[PDB]
Design a protein around this nucleic acid. Structure first.
Ligand code: MN
Length: 476
RNA sequence: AUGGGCCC
RNA sequence: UGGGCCC
C-alpha cells in the first residue's frame, strides 16, 4: 500500500510486549534457528539501531497505478476467472441472514465468540459478548446501527493494529520484521459474511485446482487429490510472492470486486461496496493514526478468499500480457492466499513474467533458491504448499503432507504455559508423515514427561481419513 | 494477542 | 468454551 498521511491522535491504545511463547524441553535439544517475534521496542536481541515500528510498516512501498491498457487486460482476466468460478460454484450467492452470518452455514464456520472486538469497542472496553450474544444468533443496538449505516453506505471505520505473537526465523527476529495483524470491527466482519458468506461457504466445499483454491481443504486427505492432479503435468512451479497482501494495488482490488461480486451472479449491491472499503483504510498503531491506500488488511472477513481470487487473476493476467492466446485451460493452479502452485504442459518462462507481475505491484521469486531464475522440468515432489511437501506413502501409495524436520523442531521447541500436552497431540498429527524414525526423534525429549501418541495410532487414523476403504481392503 | 481453513 | 498448525 501507500502511506498518504500520518498524525498523532490524543488517545492511545495498548499493544502486546508480553510474548507468551516460552521455550520447552525440546528447545535445548534441537537448538533451532527460530524464536518469538520481537514485540518490544527495546528488545535486547534486536540489531543495533533498529527502530521496531519503523520496520513494521516497511511493507508499504507504494500503490502501483495501472494504465488503461493494463486495467482493461486485468478486467478481462477477472471476468474470465469469475465466469469459470461461478460456473462451478453456481449463482446461488444471495444475501445471508443475520442468524446464518453469526452461526455459519454448511461450509462456513461460526464467528469466534471470544476474540478482539476492534474499534471503537476496544477503547471503551466492550467485548463481542456485550454486542453480539453467544449461541443466540442476534445483534445488539450498537451493531444494529452499523448495519443500517452500511445499507446507506455512510459507514466508516479504522483498523486496529496488533503485533503478531508467533515463532519466526532468528534472522527476521533480529531484523525486527514482526508481522502485524489488522483487526477490523466486528460489525464489518459480520456484514461481510452477510454479503458474501454464501459465496465463501460454496468455495470451501468446492476447493481444488478447478476453481484454483485450497481454502477449505484438509491436507491429510486432500494431498492425494492435489498430488495426482499436478503429477499429471510436465512443468510445476513453486512461486513465492514478496509481501503479497500489502502490495495489492487499488486498481487491481477495485476491478476484481467489480467483476467477481456482481449482481448478475446473485450478490447484493453492497457486496461490491463492502469489499471496496478495504482499499482505503485508516490504521491505528498506539498514538499514530496512519491512512493507507491499497493493500489487503490481514484480519477482515474472507481475507484468504480475496487473496486467493487475486492470486488466480494475477497468473492469468501475467501470462496474457507476455504470451498471446492464453486461456484458463492453458495452465492449472491452486493457491491459498499468497501461497501458490502452478503447472502446465507448455514450457512457460516465469522469469519473463517477473516484470508483468511488477505492473500489478507484485514481486515473484522462486521458492527453490538454487539458481534462482525459474527453471523448468520440476515436479510436484519438488514443490511446497502450505509448508508441506508432496511425498508418496510407502504403504498405502498415496500422497501425504510432509513438513520439514527443522520446521517441526521449531514448532515443538516453543509453547504457551500449560498448552504443551495438548500441542504435542496436535503436532504429532503433522509429524506422523515424516516417518517412524523421524517421529520418534522429534518426540524423544518429551518421553517420560508428557503423553506421546504412538506412530501406529496416528498412521492408522490417517489411513482411514485419506480413504477409509484402503484400511478395509488390507483385511481381505 | 485478527480473518478464515483444517485437526483436536 | 479451550489448544495447535497453515495461509
Ligand atoms: Mn509456496
Amino acid at each position: 500500500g501507500l502511506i498518504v498521511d500520518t498524525r498523532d491522535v490524543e488517545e492511545r491504545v495498548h499493544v502486546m510486549r508480553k510474548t507468551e511463547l516460552a521455550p520447552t524441553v525440546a528447545h535445548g535439544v534441537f537448538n533451532p534457528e527460530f524464536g518469538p517475534a520481537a514485540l518490544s521496542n527495546k528488545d535486547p536481541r534486536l540489531n543495533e539501531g533498529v527502530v521496531l515500528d519503523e520496520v513494521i510498516f516497511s511493507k508499504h512501498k507504494g500503490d502501483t497505478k495501472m494504465s488503461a491498457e493494463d486495467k482493461a487486460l486485468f478486467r478481462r482476466c477477472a471476468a474470465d476467472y469469475a465466469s469459470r468460478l461461478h460456473s462451478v460454484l453456481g449463482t446461488a450467492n444471495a444475501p445471508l441472514s443475520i442468524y446464518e452470518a453469526i452461526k455459519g452455514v454448511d461450509g462456513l464456520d461460526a464467528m469466534e465468540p471470544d476474540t478482539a472486538p476492534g474499534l471503537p469497542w476496544a477503547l471503551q472496553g466492550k467485548r463481542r459478548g456485550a454486542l453480539i450474544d453467544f449461541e443466540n444468533g442476534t445483534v445488539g443496538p450498537e451493531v444494529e446501527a452499523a448495519l443500517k449505516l452500511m445499507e446507506k453506505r455512510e459507514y466508516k471505520f479504522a483498523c486496529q493494529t496488533f503485533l503478531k505473537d508467533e515463532i519466526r526465523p532468528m534472522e527476521k527476529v533480529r531484523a525486527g520484521k514482526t508481522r502485524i495483524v489488522d483487526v477490523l470491527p466486528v460489525e464489518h466482519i459480520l456484514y461481510t459474511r452477510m454479503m458474501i458468506g454464501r459465496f465463501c461457504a460454496q468455495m470451501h466445499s468446492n476447493n481444488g485446482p478447478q476453481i484454483g483454491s485450497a481454502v477449505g481443504c484438509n491436507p491429510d486427505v486432500d494431498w492425494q487429490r492435489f498430488g495426482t492432479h499436478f503429477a499429471q503435468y510436465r512443468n510445476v512451479w513453486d512461486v513465492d510472492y514478496s509481501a503479497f497482501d500489502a502490495n495489492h494495488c487499488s486498481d487491481a482490488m477495485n476491478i476484481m470486486f467489480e467483476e467477481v461480486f456482481r449482481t448478475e451472479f446473485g450478490f447484493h449491491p453492497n457486496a461490491e461496496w463492502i469489499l471496496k472499503t478495504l482499499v482505503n483504510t485508516e490504521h491505528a498503531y498506539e498514538n499514530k493514526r496512519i491512512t493507507v491506500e491499497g493493500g489487503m488488511p490481514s484480519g477482515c472477513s474472507a481475507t484468504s478468499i480475496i487473496n486467493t481470487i487475486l492470486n488466480n487473476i494475477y497468473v492469468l493476467y501475467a501470462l496474457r500480457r507476455h504470451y498471446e492466446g492464453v486461456e484458463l485451460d492453458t495452465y492449472t493452479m491452486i493457491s491459498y492466499g499468497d501461497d501458490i502452485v502452478v503447472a502446465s504442459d507448455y514450457d512457460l518462462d516465469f522469469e519473463a513474467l517477473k516484470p508483468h507481475f511488477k505492473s500489478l505491484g507484485q514481486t515473484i521469486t522462486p521458492a527453490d533458491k538454487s539458481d534462482k531464475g525459474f527453471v523448468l522440468g520440476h515436479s510436484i515432489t519438488d514443490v511446497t504448499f502450505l509448508k508441506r511437501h508432496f511425498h508418496m506413502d510407502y504403504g498405502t501409495g498415496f500422497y501425504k503432507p510432509v513438513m520439514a524436520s527443522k520446521t517441526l523442531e521449531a514448532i515443538l521447541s516453543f509453547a504457551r504455559r500449560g498448552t504443551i500436552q495438548e500441542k504435542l497431540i496436535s503436532v504429532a498429527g503433522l509429524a506422523v508423515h515424516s516417518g517412524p524414525d523421524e517421529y520418534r526423534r522429534l518426540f524423544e525429549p518429551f518421553q517420560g514427561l508428557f503423553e506421546i501418541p504412538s506412530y501406529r495410532s496416528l498412521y492408522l487414523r490417517w489411513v482411514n481419513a485419506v480413504c477409509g476403504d484402503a484400511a478395509a481392503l488390507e483385511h481381505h
